[PDB]
Design a protein around this nucleic acid. Structure first.
Ligand code: YB
Ligand code: YB
Ligand code: YB
Ligand code: YB
Lengths: 85, 85
DNA sequence: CCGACCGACGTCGGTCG
DNA sequence: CCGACCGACGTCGGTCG
């Protein structure tokens, strides 16, 4: 349901997960490993590294946005998703 | 906007991406590397391996569901997501 | 079409300054 | 708080039967 996508360099996003899990565990539901959108040849990737963070509620997401610092050069987008099937 | 989450074993989902990219490229927008939800200790993961597949439109997603076979023991869920910020 | 398997390599958790 | 860096290892693209 309520989630955010955080993007940066792969190393950046990995180390960010480490500290979020360590210091701000109560501010989010779950978090993912680091992923990329794949491109067309071999192991090519497109775009920046990403993690997905889910929230229990939108209030929780707001708590997160207010309290967890975002390193320079990282970006965050927030979505709400309905199950289709 | 319109997406699906496909889950299975990590090897299962990787090999599935290989064939989807190879045979059914026109049936989807983009696809991700394989990811997991992390757990609480060391490199522990929770749940099955996942890939995210995006679609250009819901009609495209329907084309995909009708034409691309899903191996036994894999699962697919479909969502629609609105940008919050 | 499927996925165990190959060797390769980049992401892994963690450290530290 | 931040992220280059460490050595480790599991996911990587690809093969094949
Ligand atoms: Yb390319
Ligand atoms: Yb655990
Ligand atoms: Yb191996
Ligand atoms: Yb290295």
């Amino acid at each position: 349901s309520c989630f955010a996508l955080i993007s940066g360099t792969a190393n950046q996003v990995k180390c960010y997960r480490f500290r979020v899990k360590k210091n701000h565990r109560h501010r989010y539901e779950n978090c993912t490993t680091t992923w990329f959108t794949v491109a067309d040849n071999g192991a090519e990737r497109q775009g920046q590294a990403q993690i997905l963070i889910t929230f229990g509620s939108p209030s929780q997401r707001q708590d997160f946005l207010k309290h967890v610092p975002l390193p320079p050069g990282m970006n965050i987008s927030g979505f709400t998703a309905s199950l289709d099937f």
